[PDB]
């Protein structure tokens, strides 16, 4: 399952912080698109776990959809 | 007690994220100095708790000690 999220990243640092919390979670393959403020995650982790993980950054996150 | 932390924030978005995680924790009085990458926190929360809360952002965090 490839989950797509909007994440309000406004600099390179914001992008790297997203990658670090995702790394900490583990069991993920992801790509972070800074200019489009979009994070795509391939994972067996539920949408709720991914959402909660991303929201720990303190950034504004919303779910865009799936696959 | 009055604690000081270094937090590797590079833009205003990074400062907001720190603000959001500290607000979510509660029981804190803080000020964020973006250009100096420093966050001062007065709290009854342990150093451990404050450290862990800051490290949630996925930003690089270190401890600058008691004021």
Curated annotation (Swiss-Prot), chains A, B:
Keywords: Acetylation, Chaperone, Copper, Copper transport, Ion transport, Metal-binding, Phosphoprotein, Transport. Transmembrane segments: none annotated. Residues 1-62 form the HMA domain. The gene is ATOX1. GO terms for molecular function: ATPase binding; copper chaperone activity; copper ion binding; copper-dependent protein binding; cuprous ion binding; metallochaperone activity. It comes from Homo sapiens (Human). Cu cation binds at residues 11, 14. This is Copper transport protein ATOX1. Ubiquitous. The modification N6-acetyllysine is found at residue 59. The keyword Transcription does not apply. The heavy-metal-associated domain (HMA) coordinates a Cu(+) ion via the cysteine residues within the CXXC motif. The transfer of Cu(+) ion from ATOX1 to ATP7A involves the formation of a three-coordinate Cu(+)-bridged heterodimer where the metal is shared between the two metal binding sites of ATOX1 and ATP7A. The Cu(+) ion appears to switch between two coordination modes, forming two links with one protein and one with the other. Cisplatin, a chemotherapeutic drug, can bind the CXXC motif and hinder the release of Cu(+) ion. Disulfide bonds: none annotated. Changing residue 14 to A: Impairs Cu(+)-bridged heterodimer formation with ATP7A.
């Amino acid at each position: 399952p490839k989950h797509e999220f909007s994440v309000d990243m406004t600099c390179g640092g914001c992008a790297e912080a997203v990658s670090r919390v995702l790394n900490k979670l583990g069991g993920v393959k992801y790509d972070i698109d800074l200019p489009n403020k979009k994070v795509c995650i391939e994972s067996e982790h539920s949408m709720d776990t991914l959402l909660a993980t991303l929201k720990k950054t303190g950034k504004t996150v919303s779910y865009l959809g799936l696959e």
